[PDB]
Amino acid sequence: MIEDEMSREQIIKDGGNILVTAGAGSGKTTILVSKIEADLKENKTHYSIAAVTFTNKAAKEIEGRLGYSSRGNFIGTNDGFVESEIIRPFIKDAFGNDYPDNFTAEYFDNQFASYDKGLQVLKYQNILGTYSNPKKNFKFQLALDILKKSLVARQYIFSKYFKIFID
Amino acid sequence: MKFSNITIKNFRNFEKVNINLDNKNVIFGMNDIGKTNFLYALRFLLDKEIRKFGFNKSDYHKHDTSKKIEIILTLDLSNYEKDEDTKKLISVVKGARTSANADVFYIALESKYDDKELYGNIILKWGSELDNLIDIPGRGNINALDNVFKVIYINPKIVIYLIEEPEISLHRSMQIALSKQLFEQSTYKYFFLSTHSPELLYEMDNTRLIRVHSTEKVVCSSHMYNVEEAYGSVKKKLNKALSSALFAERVLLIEGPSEKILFEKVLDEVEPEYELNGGFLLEVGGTYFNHYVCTLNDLGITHIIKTDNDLKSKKGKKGVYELLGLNRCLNLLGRENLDEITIDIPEDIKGKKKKERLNERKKEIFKQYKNEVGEFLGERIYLSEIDLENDLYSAIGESMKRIFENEDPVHYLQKSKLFNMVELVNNLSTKDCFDVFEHEKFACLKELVGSDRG
Amino acid sequence: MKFSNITIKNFRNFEKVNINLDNKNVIFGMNDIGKTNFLYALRFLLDKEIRKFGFNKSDYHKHDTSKKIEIILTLDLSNYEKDEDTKKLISVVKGARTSANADVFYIALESKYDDKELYGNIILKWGSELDNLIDIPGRGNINALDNVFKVIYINPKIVIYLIEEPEISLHRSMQIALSKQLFEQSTYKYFFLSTHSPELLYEMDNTRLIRVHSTEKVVCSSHMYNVEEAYGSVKKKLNKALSSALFAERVLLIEGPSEKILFEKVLDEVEPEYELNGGFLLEVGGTYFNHYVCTLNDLGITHIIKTDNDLKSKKGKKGVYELLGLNRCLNLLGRENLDEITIDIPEDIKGKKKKERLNERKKEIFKQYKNEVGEFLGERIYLSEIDLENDLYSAIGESMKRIFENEDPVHYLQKSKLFNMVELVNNLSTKDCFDVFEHEKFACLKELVGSDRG
């Protein structure tokens, strides 16, 4: 039934990578919830999903429509995904035992413009900082370097997470 | 995932007991208290219903001495390089393990002392190494380990079964059905089984057998059990012979049921029920001695072997003979089988003088290899000179020529092995049984009765 | 005194079950509910702790149909004339027996219907005759029968024991010691024993064996078990052989372990675990089949017998033989043993050609007694023509020609019965197993499997 119904029925029973070019707001999160409800009910294994949004308020709205679950799903911002799944469990493995595991990550004070100087903030004064440029991400690039270096980070993120939902 | 070992540093009945593990474990022994405390230690480590109550005063070795209970389990978390099972078995935990190439995973328990506030305060920790152990992160009343293991306890998600005494109020055909179900069907991937009936071990393979010693201080010995492809065609007979013999203290390995007739008549006359103290007669015939000796010496059970010196003709070859009787116990001793020997005899008469010629030959090869016979007698391997029948004629020969009106009484009993032995032991007296018990060639009976020196 | 029989005219699981009794009774079977209701019937007749509660509505065959429960027991009050126990046995009761020359005594139970007031109203009557039954005099709460019989019930003044499943949480050596305590010590003069483990019957004498059938409507069969003085020297072998075979539905009696190896390999290949549905292989060596066939025909367990037509030389005489393998089947059918036969054979070569003369004489004797062979075939008696190996050569002889590089494959199997046969069953394919299963000479396997005709 024209562009409305056939787009919904072809997006529920799909199983591959999906690129949806939705409109200018007004309910893009309806299909994000409805796909997750279809994907979680279809899959009966121990694998869980991960939903990523930018603002924290939309993460609560996705969580509100979903309900609650004990499957180990991650619903939240992309900053919370990188800081809690890649860096904090595996900082002491990939970048030496002397690197600390607990830190506070403020993005209000630091304005450094070097990667190697960035590790000196984390190693010495227990602060996780941010890059100088808006066209950079020190947190997301550190998660790429830890995943590329250590092994047990790669043994985690494939075997728990089924599909990452991006918005 | 394959269980490696469990060590209990303290419990209500254990002092320093370390038991090697595998999948499909079977525990037995004399001390039932130690078995149920082993299963209770497993429930304390892996089940929340016993974990949430804490420790009491009574669950210690001494009730005030050395207040430190530790139960450590080894997991062997990695798999083969051709399988991606390693990743999804790794999945649940994040920061326990440090090394990128970590092969071993530990699950440990820690108990607070009971001097203050009168409680146990169960503290759990995993980690990849025994040092720098990290506490299990729990957010509410459920910690992270509860979503991994699902423990099902049977007594009349990784699924772990714990079965305690399933043979009670059960017919034996259902016990054979049950043993087929755990040892063949892939649903029972992990279990621990405590049993007292041999019918639950009638079909077993790729299993770990744990025995508890009879002493009040429990010592546990474990053996990994496997049946090879060469023994797979007659596997049921070894399993049925071994399941009943696993529950004894001293065993005797013999060849045929005629030796069972003779030895059981002798033991009934001289010994007041040797089976009560743990003596068992084992029936093995046509197979090799290495499997039973390995599975009994690894399990802590002493074994005594009485065997004959027999010659085998080689199939399709005439005049060449095999030294089976020596070679079985040399390959028990780890030595290679000796070379094949031959004799050149005319056709003559095949009935009577032939057995005399091989009897003289057997005496010669016994006389050639006396140092090996001394090493054989160093262990509990008692080898007869020609047959057991000639030792019987050397022992009870007067009564044997009294019973048998034949001039030689050793030929009539070799004419029919089974029927002549029953008629021999039917008209026998008590004094002759003490005579064969006294004789040095039948010292296997003296070792089977197991009289303690001190 | 000596218990004779029990009839249960109505109970929660019984309709018209009549069981003959004795001292030292043993009850077993597939139906556990029938055994525990038999023991509860004994408790209702013989104990006050169950009598004082009365009958409930659920303790009937149908809950409203045929509300009349009668449990009758017979005592055999008379003793021997050389023992003065008769007067002391009689003098507990006075008015029950009208004449002093009465032989037997009755104890009966009667239940008032549960239509009104919803209560059982247990009434106890005794007397010497079934007609004009009289009540048991109870002056207060304790009746006159309670001072006579004392019931001690064990579950994990004439004394009657009631033991229900004592093999729970017990080591098997303790079970053999308990069987010695039950069947040897004169303290346990009267008991009723229910068990599911064969280790409590490793030795038994002067006992009554009660078997409960596998159907829902219970039919019970009883047999008086006794070991004669001729079999007393090998009584342990018969008891250990029979204790495991008592808990099966279809048995096979064979001679040696080579037949066990062959039949276990074949039945492991074609049949999906015959041991599940009630198949068992029993080892008979050196003894006649009469004891096993009586103790299995009396219990309702079907029996299949496969044996060899063998010849045995007489003691002290040369050239005279006995038709032993035929005499066993003849005295299994109740006929007397035939007279011995003599032949004149030259000395020749005693190894090979004498077996050929014995084989053609065996064929001549097998052709001569064909009517008795057909009479054996009418029952489940399968007698081989010469040996079992010749039937194997008639079935799969080309396969053994492939296996053994000798031109004749049957003699090398007679050269060593235990070692060559293992090498035969090791190099066997799955096609030959269906061939030996489908042959007319091996219909004992088809009778052992027991496919339901309809």
From Swiss-Prot, chain A:
<protein>
    <recommendedName>
        <fullName>Gabija protein GajB</fullName>
    </recommendedName>
</protein>
<feature type="binding site">
    <location>
        <begin position="22"/>
        <end position="29"/>
    </location>
    <ligand>
        <name>ATP</name>
    </ligand>
</feature>
<comment type="subunit">
    <text>Homodimer. Interacts with GajA; 2 GajB dimers dock at opposite sides of the GajA complex to form a 4:4 GajA-GajB assembly (GajAB). GajAB interacts with Bacillus phage Phi3T Gad1 protein; this interaction forms a 4:4:8 GajAB-Gad1 complex and leads to GajAB inhibition.</text>
</comment>
<comment type="function">
    <text>Component of antiviral defense system Gabija type I, composed of GajA and GajB. Expression of Gabija type I in B.subtilis (strain BEST7003) confers resistance to phages phi105, phi29, rho14, SpBeta and SBSphiC. Expression of Gabija type I in E.coli B (strain ATCC 11303) confers resistance to phage T7. May be a helicase or contribute to GajA activation.</text>
</comment>
<feature type="domain" description="UvrD-like helicase ATP-binding">
    <location>
        <begin position="6"/>
        <end position="167"/>
    </location>
</feature>
<feature type="site" description="Interaction with GajA">
    <location>
        <position position="155"/>
    </location>
</feature>
<comment type="similarity">
    <text>Belongs to the helicase family.</text>
</comment>
<feature type="site" description="Interaction with GajA">
    <location>
        <position position="152"/>
    </location>
</feature>
Swiss-Prot record, chains B, C:
<feature type="binding site">
    <location>
        <position position="255"/>
    </location>
    <ligand>
        <name>a divalent metal cation 1</name>
    </ligand>
</feature>
<keyword id="KW-0540">Nuclease</keyword>
<dbReference type="InterPro" id="IPR051396">
    <property type="entry name" value="Bact_Antivir_Def_Nuclease"/>
</dbReference>
<keyword id="KW-0051">Antiviral defense</keyword>
<feature type="binding site">
    <location>
        <position position="259"/>
    </location>
    <ligand>
        <name>a divalent metal cation 2</name>
    </ligand>
</feature>
<dbReference type="GO" id="GO:0046872">
    <property type="term" value="F:metal ion binding"/>
</dbReference>
<dbReference type="InterPro" id="IPR034139">
    <property type="entry name" value="TOPRIM_OLD"/>
</dbReference>
<feature type="binding site">
    <location>
        <begin position="32"/>
        <end position="36"/>
    </location>
    <ligand>
        <name>ATP</name>
    </ligand>
</feature>
<keyword id="KW-0378">Hydrolase</keyword>
<comment type="subunit">
    <text>Homotetramer. Forms the core of the anti-phage defense complex. Interacts with GajB; 2 GajB dimers dock at opposite sides of the GajA complex to form a 4:4 GajA-GajB assembly (GajAB). GajAB interacts with Bacillus phage Phi3T Gad1 protein; this interaction forms a 4:4:8 GajAB-Gad1 complex and leads to GajAB inhibition.</text>
</comment>
<protein>
    <recommendedName>
        <fullName>Endonuclease GajA</fullName>
        <ecNumber>3.1.-.-</ecNumber>
    </recommendedName>
</protein>
<dbReference type="Pfam" id="PF20469">
    <property type="entry name" value="OLD-like_TOPRIM"/>
</dbReference>
<dbReference type="GO" id="GO:0051607">
    <property type="term" value="P:defense response to virus"/>
</dbReference>
<dbReference type="Pfam" id="PF13175">
    <property type="entry name" value="AAA_15"/>
</dbReference>
<feature type="site" description="Interaction with GajB">
    <location>
        <position position="97"/>
    </location>
</feature>
<feature type="binding site">
    <location>
        <position position="339"/>
    </location>
    <ligand>
        <name>a divalent metal cation 1</name>
    </ligand>
</feature>
<feature type="region of interest" description="ATPase domain">
    <location>
        <begin position="1"/>
        <end position="217"/>
    </location>
</feature>
<dbReference type="InterPro" id="IPR027417">
    <property type="entry name" value="P-loop_NTPase"/>
</dbReference>
<keyword id="KW-0945">Host-virus interaction</keyword>
<feature type="binding site">
    <location>
        <position position="340"/>
    </location>
    <ligand>
        <name>a divalent metal cation 1</name>
    </ligand>
</feature>
<comment type="function">
    <text>Component of antiviral defense system Gabija type I, composed of GajA and GajB. Has no detected ATPase activity. Expression of Gabija type I in B.subtilis (strain BEST7003) confers resistance to phages phi105, phi29, rho14, SpBeta and SBSphiC. Expression of Gabija type I in E.coli B (strain ATCC 11303) confers resistance to phage T7.</text>
</comment>
<keyword id="KW-0255">Endonuclease</keyword>
